[PDB]
């Protein structure tokens, strides 16, 4: 009765929370509608071939790495089903169980819009289209090529010649497997992304704990329990004490609603960023440095995490740099207006115990001198910095 004359405060709180939850559902639907691929390949066992990505394959429905990530995160299990009867026995309380407190305090945690199996279906369908994103204008067509072919086409496009890839097939596969295998022993304190996952879970828990903690507050009253001040005082002062408690609790709820609105508004921008990352790093190879990962981006995978997505970007990291001498281009001394420039590579000076001032071609990302031919050169207009070579005349200059 005392609260009944406070009017539409409780209704305002309820409406604000309802709208925030509706917006969260709409954000989930939009993100997973933009994540879904139109065509994909079935994930059979051994998908990947020489590349061991079995930790991305679903165990007959979540992945192995997704299960590991969910296991290593300290997250309280919500009920969502017969969770009311789980707290009926409850044993002794487990360090302020915030899952059993909702039936006491008077709040409720709603289940997420989609099941674990449906989210895993979306993520697995995304994994099966990674190889066939299409080398040519790949949005409306799907080529069901093997994973190895796609990886070698991605490597060839960053500056590694076909000769090197053909020579080092097994070494490349082993080096990729070494990088992907160190992932299982990665979820620890030094892992920054895992710490961010735990921070999000802890933010959820803190939001619930603030609500659960203000019910013991005594806002300048004789007690925090309404039923206790009722059986100790009389109406004229009972009303004052109960009104003190009512105002305190209403202020607490208003603050909680405002903070939830701020957090929900931040999560929508984060979801848009995740949408952009899925469209740019997982469904394509990105040419912009730093956006997907470090080094040179090659391929990215994504799995589900407690409150979002977990991206694994595989990058090409060079080591053991050497310095060589290179030319901007080569011109024919006899015919000076006949010149060539390297394509996705460099003209280097060889030292292969052979003819003097020989010129070779190397890829831009791996050192491996090769003969100069029309496949790795292109004709250009002469420049003052080009080398005028008289003898040995690589075949394009002949």
């Amino acid at each position: 009765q005392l609260l009944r004359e406070y009017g539409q405060f409780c209704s305002k709180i309820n409406q604000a929370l309802h709208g925030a939850n509706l917006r969260q559902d709409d954000s989930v639907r939009n993100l997973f509608a933009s994540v879904k691929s139109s065509q994909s390949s079935p994930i059979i066992p051994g998908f990947g071939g020489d590349f061991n990505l079995t930790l991305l394959e679903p165990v007959s429905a979540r992945s192995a790495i997704e299960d590991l990530l969910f296991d290593k995160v300290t997250i309280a299990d919500p009920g969502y089903m017969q969770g009311y009867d789980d707290c009926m026995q409850q044993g002794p309380a487990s360090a302020r169980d915030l899952i059993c407190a909702q039936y006491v305090a008077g709040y409720k945690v709603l289940p997420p819009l989609m099941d674990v199996n449906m989210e895993a279906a979306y993520t697995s369908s995304l994994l099966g289209s990674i190889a066939g994103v299409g080398w040519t204008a790949g949005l409306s067509s799907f080529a069901a090529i093997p994973f190895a072919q796609s990886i070698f086409y991605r490597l060839n496009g960053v500056g590694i010649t076909q000769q090197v890839l053909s020579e080092n097939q097994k070494l490349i596969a082993n080096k990729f497997n070494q990088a992907l295998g160190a992932m299982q022993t990665g979820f620890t304190t030094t892992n920054e992304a895992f710490q961010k996952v735990q921070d999000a879970v802890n933010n959820n828990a803190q939001a619930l704990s603030k609500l659960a903690s203000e019910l013991s507050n005594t806002f300048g009253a004789i007690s925090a329990s309404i039923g206790d001040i009722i059986q100790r005082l009389d109406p004229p002062e009972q009303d004052a004490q109960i009104d003190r408690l009512i105002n305190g609790r209403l202020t607490t709820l208003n603050a909680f609603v405002a903070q939830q609105l701020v957090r929900s508004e931040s999560a929508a921008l984060s979801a848009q960023l995740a949408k952009d990352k899925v469209n740019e790093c997982v469904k394509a190879q990105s040419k912009r440095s730093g956006f997907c990962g470090q080094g040179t981006h090659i391929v990215s995978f994504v799995v589900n995490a407690p409150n979002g997505l977990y991206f694994m970007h595989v990058g090409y990291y060079p080591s053991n740099h050497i310095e060589v001498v290179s030319a901007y281009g080569l011109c024919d001394a006899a015919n000076p207006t006949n010149c060539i420039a390297p394509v996705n590579g460099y003209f280097i000076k060889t030292n292969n115990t052979r003819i003097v001032d020989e010129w070779s071609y190397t890829g831009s990302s791996f050192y491996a001198p090769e003969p100069i031919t029309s496949l790795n050169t292109k004709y250009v207009a002469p420049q003052v910095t080009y080398q005028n070579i008289s003898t040995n005349l690589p075949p394009p200059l002949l």
Binding site: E5, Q8, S11, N14, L17, H18
Partner: protein, 336 residues
Amino acid sequence: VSKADGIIYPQGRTYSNITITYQGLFPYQGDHGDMYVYSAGHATGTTPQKLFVANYSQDVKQFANGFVVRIGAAANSTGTVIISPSTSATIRKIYPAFMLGSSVGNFSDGKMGRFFNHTLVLLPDGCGTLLRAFYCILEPRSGNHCPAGNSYTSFATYHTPATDCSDGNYNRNASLNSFKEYFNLRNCTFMYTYNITEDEILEWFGITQTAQGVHLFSSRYVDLYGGNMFQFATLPVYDTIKYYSIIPHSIRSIQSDRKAWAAFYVYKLQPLTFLLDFSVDGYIRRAIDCGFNDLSQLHCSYESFDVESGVYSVSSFEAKPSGSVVEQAEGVECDF
């Protein structure tokens, strides 16, 4: 409540073409109330024998907020007489009689239903033409078949349609005289009178009490084809009314000339919050009891009659305390 039954209009102001929540004294949605029926008396041919009433005079109820009454609901219809179950007749609207007070006790033979020092009385007269209200302290008379006398069953009023309900002159004291046969009005106070124009239209009547006296409501002088109830009187009653009762009334008509009097229903009032829809002409055509069910709480939370589809959190059920548990001591035990 979806057609604004028993709604007392906000008695300060008026609105136009809006919808607002309002805190007042309304009845529960779906409430059935208490039904009361009035019947003709015993008659042999052309001579009324005696009065046929129920035990209403013995049934004393609590006032505690006031109440509302639905008069004339089952009119212009074919029903049956009470004392002649196999006798169809057209039903006629009749008006209730109330007697309210602050102290109750027993009659001569310990019969429940006696009102002490001051007892407000509201009784229609003139064979359904006027209503009179008065304090008029009741004094039980000693005689045959009378309250303070021998062989007492129940006090009741009556009127004879053969003489009293005459087209030329409706006896405006017949019911008062009938009431006078059982009680002696002593040390009486204000004795008002209000005029009612005859029809066969459903109407409403309410009564509340505040620091400014006893308020009387009705929908006859403002809204007649509606039912919205407006104040039309205030009484210098300032004693806090705790109890009330109905007054039985029998019609001493000819055995060959008997009608059916529509039953009237009484519904209590409570301090609830309603959602009222005021139309352009300012009348309340529909309302919502905010505490009836969960859909009603949704409607009142948005204070609209149209709520969008969705899944809405509502008030939760709380476990009921089954038993009790205590623990304590003695004071030592005495040493005999």
